[PDB]
Design a binder for this molecule. Structure first.
Ligand SMILES: NC(=O)c1ccc[n+]([C@@H]2O[C@H](COP(=O)([O-])OP(=O)(O)OC[C@H]3O[C@@H](n4cnc5c(N)ncnc54)[C@H](O)[C@@H]3O)[C@@H](O)[C@H]2O)c1
Ligand SMILES: NC(=O)c1ccc[n+]([C@@H]2O[C@H](COP(=O)([O-])OP(=O)(O)OC[C@H]3O[C@@H](n4cnc5c(N)ncnc54)[C@H](O)[C@@H]3O)[C@@H](O)[C@H]2O)c1
Ligand SMILES: *OC(*)(*)(*)(*)C1(*)(*)(*)=C(*)(*)(*)(F(*)*)C(*)(*)(*)(*)(F(*)*)=C(*)(*)(F*)C(*)(*)(F*)=C1(*)(*)(*)F*
Ligand SMILES: *OC(*)(*)(*)(*)C1(*)(*)(*)=C(*)(*)(*)(F(*)*)C(*)(*)(*)(F(*)(*)*)=C(*)(*)(F(*)*)[C@](*)(F*)=C1(*)(*)(*)F*
Ligand SMILES: [Zn+2]
Ligand SMILES: [Zn+2]
Ligand SMILES: [Zn+2]
Ligand SMILES: [Zn+2]
Lengths: 374, 374
């Protein structure tokens, strides 16, 4: 029916930064060779989407953001093998071409075909598949999930369990997988250890989930929003700290609390200052600190190199270290097998048209994850 | 004979920074319980000793510097069970009390009894065993090897093979073990990988030895002093680069010649800029950079945290990551079994009286490691 035809549908377009998303009627071109058109079912609102609006994260505008979602394959372009119409799929913002040096490496997951380092806002052939009022609109991370339909590259999609709850498993497109793997895969949190997690939003709580599943003996959640505490305890935190309650720095407090420093700390906010503090918090001779938060564009932090010379380790990771195509489908199965829970991350469900309301809840600090249903 | 009595001997005293060492007569008190008095046989000139002179490295003055050496036990205090008079020993600038958290940790080596973080320049009891011109002189890292005799705590001394050439194994006291351990133990260089080593002095060449030992396929030596290249090629470097020969920044040059970045890079100079540069030139998704050089006191570096977010790992280490008391004797044995060569690092051998000429050879870039003999 729609196959081979330009679809006219609704999409939330961001024309200028610091503006609300305007639901517009856009024309989604049919998938070219090796591309896949997807009908969106559920998409989550991640902080990185808000960074685009805030101007924190620079990307070509106008653009259709959205990168955490799950849908159904409508049509596939010429050459597509991995999926076919009717398939349930999760678009992957970190592709997996399986051909570059990174994809061929045992532990790298930052595929060279990504559109993150230097965003272009186009398809692999450098063109867009979205038009609004005769004006081409940019893609976002090769995903652009804030649209009833979207076109992604074959390398940027994973087929998932046909029986999976699309309205929940969408969290596996970013938030969950990022948090879980940051603790489990990047930091490789050990049993009995003490962990510190700065930022208790969807991604942070998923970090706590990873730490808890890794058998962490102590998991101290850190946030300036106390209303996050109860939910944090719920998913694993053993204690929660609000930096506003003290007269001394949180690094001093956390070091005193942990008797010399934590074993693993995670920065899940996106602030330069909290990135340094998370480093300082870990034990000087063997602590490990992982940056999960996305920093403001072009900002450089300053730190004393002696923090590392004593023995600390500092690393970062996109998508929790998971090779997208390989991991997403297996992560979904683990969900179907009740190996972990996504339910505590979802605080609100709203229809797609109410996206702006969904971003205000996040900015207000009233929600963890809001899922948008089409 | 001299046991239980003060000893009058010569030692190189640094009264004020940026001044030459004064070879003078000092009185070395007898060892107290759990202390050991050593007759120095050989001591190498490490750049960290030069940092004390320059004021780059802050420690209480006046002081008797020196930390890379080998000697013989003259007498032991009460309770000393690990060594005995006549034993060949290597003083350890990084101790191993074996009781603290770090000591108990399987990975940590930065013993909490160290005198590196908050240098107070005394013995573990708060006192000094040195007197010069009637005044008490400070110890340095609990070692102070630029003296014919010295007293160190038992947790700061390791008994070595009685047949070892002290004029050589002294390098295991710092330069060699640090360079070699950084590659082998800290970075954990993989077989077939590409490494870049910044700084080709005594410790840097030891990193090259460790990289070659771990099985690195390509080891690029980076130094502004082309006179070091030959010796570097001699110990393992496959190519040597001099930033001066290029019209383009070194990180681009290295990235281009490595086809997107090295797997492992090491900063073995002690500069804020080369530390960030070394980080930059390692592959963004899986590269690891190890800081080995000592930075100037109280100086912060500036960097973009996005360098870490893509997946890079940054770490630093003291004494090559080795738990000191456990490792040094094994390192000496391996040397005895011809597992590695120290000869290539020794360019000059001078008697203790020519310490100042020794520091000039280093500053001039004329020597790699100069060993002073007593
Ligand atoms: N590395 C990746 O692949 C990846 C993936 C997903 C999200 N992110 C980034 O992770 C960060 C968090 O995303 P989220 O979706 O969980 O966000 P969120 O907005 O739900 O949560 C951020 C949390 O940090 C707290 N916070 C803010 N400032 C704080 C401070 N100064 N001190 C202590 N706590 C503070 C907030 O109250 C909030 O609870 C964002 O920067 C996002 O862009 C990165
Ligand atoms: N972490 C530890 O445990 C430990 C142990 C020993 C030494 N160190 C430190 O390691 C560093 C090296 O010590 P070393 O004894 O081998 O010193 P070294 O003086 O022999 O110096 C190494 C090299 O750095 C080179 N260099 C200087 N500036 C350069 C630049 N801008 N670019 C490229 N090359 C440059 C010099 O030409 C020299 O060849 C020092 O900072 C020292 O204090 C640390
Ligand atoms: O070379 C080892 C070394 C020293 F001696 C110091 F004094 C110091 F502070 C360091 F950090 C070192 F690595
Ligand atoms: O949430 C993941 C994420 C994004 F969407 C971005 F746009 C980005 F640049 C990141 F670095 C992210 F981690
Ligand atoms: Zn996200
Ligand atoms: Zn790839
Ligand atoms: Zn040294
Ligand atoms: Zn100890």
């Amino acid at each position: 029916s729609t196959a081979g035809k330009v679809i006219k549908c609704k999409a939330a377009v961001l024309w200028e930064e610091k503006k609300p998303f305007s639901i517009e009627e856009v024309e989604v071109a049919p998938p070219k060779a090796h591309e896949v058109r997807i009908k969106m079912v559920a998409t989550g609102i991640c902080r990185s989407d808000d960074h685009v609006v805030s101007g924190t994260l620079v990307t070509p505008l106008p653009v259709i953001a959205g990168h955490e979602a799950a849908g159904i394959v409508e049509s596939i372009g010429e050459g597509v093998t991995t999926v076919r119409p009717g398939d349930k799929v999760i678009p992957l913002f970190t592709p997996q071409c399986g051909k570059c040096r990174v994809c061929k490496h045992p532990e790298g997951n930052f595929c060279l075909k990504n559109d993150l380092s230097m965003p272009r806002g186009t398809m692999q052939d450098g063109t867009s598949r979205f038009t609004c009022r005769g004006k081409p609109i940019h893609h976002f991370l090769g995903t652009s999930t804030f649209s009833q339909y979207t076109v992604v590259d074959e390398i940027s999609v994973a087929k998932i369990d046909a029986a999976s709850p699309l309205e929940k498993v969408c969290l596996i497109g970013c938030g969950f997988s990022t948090g879980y793997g940051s603790a489990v895969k990047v930091a490789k949190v050990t049993q009995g250890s003490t962990c510190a997690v700065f930022g208790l939003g969807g991604v942070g709580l998923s970090v706590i989930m990873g730490c808890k599943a890794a058998g962490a003996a102590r998991i101290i959640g850190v946030d300036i929003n106390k209303d996050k505490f109860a939910k944090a305890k719920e998913v694993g935190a053993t204690e929660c700290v609000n930096p506003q309650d003290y007269k001394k720095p949180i690094q001093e407090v956390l070091t005193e609390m942990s008797n010399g420093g934590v074993d693993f700390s995670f920065e899940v906010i996106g602030r330069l200052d909290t990135m340094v503090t998370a480093l300082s918090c870990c034990q000087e001779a063997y602590g490990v600190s992982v940056i999960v938060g996305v920093p403001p564009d072009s900002q450089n932090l300053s730190m004393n190199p002696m923090l590392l010379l004593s023995g600390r380790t500092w690393k970062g990771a996109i998508f929790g270290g998971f090779k997208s195509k390989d991991s997403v489908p297996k992560l979904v199965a683990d969900f179907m097998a009740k190996k972990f829970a996504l339910d505590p991350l979802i605080t609100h469900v709203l229809p797609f048209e109410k996206i702006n309301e969904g971003f205000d809840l996040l900015r207000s600090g009233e929600s963890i994850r809001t899922i948008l249903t089409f």
